[PDB]
Design a protein around this motif. Structure first.
Motif, PDB file in Angstrom:
ATOM      1  N   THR A   5      15.725 -10.939   2.932  1.00 42.61           N
ATOM      2  CA  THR A   5      16.073 -10.125   4.011  1.00 42.61           C
ATOM      3  C   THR A   5      16.595  -8.822   3.998  1.00 42.61           C
ATOM      4  N   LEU A   6      15.864  -7.647   4.393  1.00 37.83           N
ATOM      5  CA  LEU A   6      16.521  -6.273   4.378  1.00 37.83           C
ATOM      6  C   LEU A   6      16.920  -6.097   5.522  1.00 37.83           C
ATOM      7  N   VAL A   7      18.295  -5.419   5.640  1.00 31.85           N
ATOM      8  CA  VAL A   7      18.796  -4.952   6.833  1.00 31.85           C
ATOM      9  C   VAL A   7      18.980  -3.432   6.566  1.00 31.85           C
ATOM     10  N   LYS A   8      18.554  -2.672   7.577  1.00 29.88           N
ATOM     11  CA  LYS A   8      18.692  -1.304   7.612  1.00 29.88           C
ATOM     12  C   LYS A   8      20.325  -0.805   8.167  1.00 29.88           C
ATOM     13  N   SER A   9      20.785   0.247   8.007  1.00 29.35           N
ATOM     14  CA  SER A   9      22.112   0.768   8.452  1.00 29.35           C
ATOM     15  C   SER A   9      21.662   2.038   9.408  1.00 29.35           C
ATOM     16  N   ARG A  10      20.469   2.559   9.542  1.00 30.29           N
ATOM     17  CA  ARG A  10      20.114   3.543  10.190  1.00 30.29           C
ATOM     18  C   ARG A  10      18.814   3.327  10.942  1.00 30.29           C
ATOM     19  N   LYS A  11      18.304   4.106  12.020  1.00 30.13           N
ATOM     20  CA  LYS A  11      17.036   3.774  12.724  1.00 30.13           C
ATOM     21  C   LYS A  11      16.148   4.548  11.462  1.00 30.13           C
ATOM     22  N   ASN A  12      16.397   5.627  11.041  1.00 30.83           N
ATOM     23  CA  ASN A  12      15.499   6.423  10.198  1.00 30.83           C
ATOM     24  C   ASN A  12      15.403   5.935   8.767  1.00 30.83           C
ATOM     25  N   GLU A  13      15.901   5.210   8.289  1.00 35.76           N
ATOM     26  CA  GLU A  13      16.123   4.550   7.145  1.00 35.76           C
ATOM     27  C   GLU A  13      14.567   3.987   6.892  1.00 35.76           C
ATOM     28  N   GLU A  14      14.324   3.791   5.550  1.00 38.39           N
ATOM     29  CA  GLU A  14      12.993   3.000   5.090  1.00 38.39           C
ATOM     30  C   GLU A  14      13.480   1.801   4.464  1.00 38.39           C
ATOM     31  N   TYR A  15      12.667   1.127   4.363  1.00 41.99           N
ATOM     32  CA  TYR A  15      12.779  -0.173   3.314  1.00 41.99           C
ATOM     33  C   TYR A  15      12.476  -0.046   1.924  1.00 41.99           C
ATOM     34  N   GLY A  16      11.708   1.201   1.652  1.00 42.11           N
ATOM     35  CA  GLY A  16      11.307   1.525   0.293  1.00 42.11           C
ATOM     36  C   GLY A  16      10.282   0.685  -0.207  1.00 42.11           C
ATOM     37  N   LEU A  17       9.389   0.245   0.546  1.00 41.20           N
ATOM     38  CA  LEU A  17       8.169  -0.736   0.059  1.00 41.20           C
ATOM     39  C   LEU A  17       6.807   0.155   0.342  1.00 41.20           C
ATOM     40  N   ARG A  18       5.897   0.137  -0.828  1.00 39.22           N
ATOM     41  CA  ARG A  18       4.566   0.730  -0.907  1.00 39.22           C
ATOM     42  C   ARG A  18       3.694  -0.644  -0.925  1.00 39.22           C
ATOM     43  N   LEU A  19       3.373  -1.102   0.375  1.00 38.05           N
ATOM     44  CA  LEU A  19       2.495  -2.343   0.198  1.00 38.05           C
ATOM     45  C   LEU A  19       0.974  -2.050   0.179  1.00 38.05           C
ATOM     46  N   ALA A  20       0.125  -2.810  -0.408  1.00 39.11           N
ATOM     47  CA  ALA A  20      -1.377  -2.805  -0.513  1.00 39.11           C
ATOM     48  C   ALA A  20      -1.984  -3.961  -0.354  1.00 39.11           C
ATOM     49  N   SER A  21      -3.175  -4.044  -0.321  1.00 36.48           N
ATOM     50  CA  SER A  21      -3.999  -5.260  -0.154  1.00 36.48           C
ATOM     51  C   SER A  21      -5.086  -5.308  -1.283  1.00 36.48           C
ATOM     52  N   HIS A  22      -5.475  -6.591  -1.635  1.00 36.23           N
ATOM     53  CA  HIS A  22      -6.673  -6.861  -2.511  1.00 36.23           C
ATOM     54  C   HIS A  22      -7.579  -7.904  -1.961  1.00 36.23           C
ATOM     55  N   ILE A  23      -8.896  -7.736  -1.844  1.00 39.26           N
ATOM     56  CA  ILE A  23      -9.523  -8.982  -1.567  1.00 39.26           C
ATOM     57  C   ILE A  23      -9.844  -9.682  -2.755  1.00 39.26           C
ATOM     58  N   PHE A  24      -9.927 -11.012  -2.677  1.00 41.40           N
ATOM     59  CA  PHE A  24     -10.097 -11.769  -3.768  1.00 41.40           C
ATOM     60  C   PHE A  24     -10.905 -12.936  -3.345  1.00 41.40           C
ATOM     61  N   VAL A  25     -11.756 -13.567  -4.327  1.00 41.45           N
ATOM     62  CA  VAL A  25     -12.646 -14.720  -3.902  1.00 41.45           C
ATOM     63  C   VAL A  25     -11.591 -15.952  -3.928  1.00 41.45           C
ATOM     64  N   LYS A  26     -11.539 -16.604  -2.681  1.00 43.28           N
ATOM     65  CA  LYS A  26     -10.485 -17.704  -2.644  1.00 43.28           C
ATOM     66  C   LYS A  26     -11.476 -18.808  -3.183  1.00 43.28           C
ATOM     67  N   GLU A  27     -12.599 -18.974  -2.708  1.00 43.17           N
ATOM     68  CA  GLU A  27     -13.355 -20.352  -3.151  1.00 43.17           C
ATOM     69  C   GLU A  27     -15.048 -19.985  -3.148  1.00 43.17           C
ATOM     70  N   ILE A  28     -15.496 -20.534  -4.007  1.00 42.32           N
ATOM     71  CA  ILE A  28     -17.188 -20.680  -4.352  1.00 42.32           C
ATOM     72  C   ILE A  28     -17.682 -21.893  -3.949  1.00 42.32           C
ATOM     73  N   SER A  29     -18.500 -21.989  -3.100  1.00 37.92           N
ATOM     74  CA  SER A  29     -19.154 -23.109  -2.504  1.00 37.92           C
ATOM     75  C   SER A  29     -19.957 -24.017  -3.661  1.00 37.92           C
ATOM     76  N   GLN A  30     -20.011 -25.166  -3.764  1.00 41.53           N
ATOM     77  CA  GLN A  30     -21.023 -25.781  -4.737  1.00 41.53           C
ATOM     78  C   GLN A  30     -22.219 -25.661  -4.303  1.00 41.53           C
ATOM     79  N   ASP A  31     -23.053 -25.520  -5.305  1.00 36.52           N
ATOM     80  CA  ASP A  31     -24.558 -25.226  -5.394  1.00 36.52           C
ATOM     81  C   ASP A  31     -25.062 -24.103  -4.398  1.00 36.52           C
ATOM     82  N   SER A  32     -24.287 -22.993  -4.764  1.00 36.21           N
ATOM     83  CA  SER A  32     -24.436 -22.073  -3.808  1.00 36.21           C
ATOM     84  C   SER A  32     -25.046 -20.652  -4.729  1.00 36.21           C
TER      85      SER A  32
END
Lengths: 83, 8, 83, 9
Positions: A5-32
């Motif tokens: 839990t991150l709680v701001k003390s001012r509206k103009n504050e920032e959390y300080g997070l640079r978030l990114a995303s990766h695509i990944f192979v979650k599953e491979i179908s049999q005989d595919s």
């Protein structure tokens, strides 16, 4: 699995997070196509689809990139233990 | 990439 | 580092891939709320934001999930297995 | 994962 839990003390504050995303192979179908290929594995992070960088890309946009080439799918993937 | 990171 | 080329032999053939997405903490700003919290680390996968699971979500989806809570931010994070 | 469906290709 850690609740944070991150709680701001001012509206103009920032959390300080640079978030990114990766695509990944979650599953491979049999005989595919993916199953029989030597070079792609469950867990692989997909760095490029058909010549386009996928870093931070949504799955919806990844789907359109895949559908663009009818018949063939080219990727650059990286082992999860290498990323 | 063309898609920037999200900063918050 | 690994080049993959999967070639369909029929129109309705599938590749056999289930692709998913992970949002992760790329960087934490110095002396920030996130840094001073101690429970978040660079590399962490964000599994949940303000009570909603994030898997398959885009950074745009996460941004609105984050902005839903005005002054505060709740997440579930999880270590990168290979850290 | 939930709410956002997976991408199956």
């Amino acid at each position: 699995g850690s609740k944070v839990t991150l709680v701001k003390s001012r509206k103009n504050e920032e959390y300080g997070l640079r978030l990114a995303s990766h695509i990944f192979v979650k599953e491979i179908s049999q005989d595919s196509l993916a199953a029989r290929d030597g070079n792609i594995q469950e867990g692989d992070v997909v760095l490029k689809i058909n010549g386009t960088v996928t870093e931070n890309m949504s799955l919806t946009d990844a789907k359109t990139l895949i559908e663009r080439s009818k018949g063939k799918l080219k990727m650059v993937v990286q082992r999860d233990w290498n990323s | 990439s063309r898609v920037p990171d999200l900063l918050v």
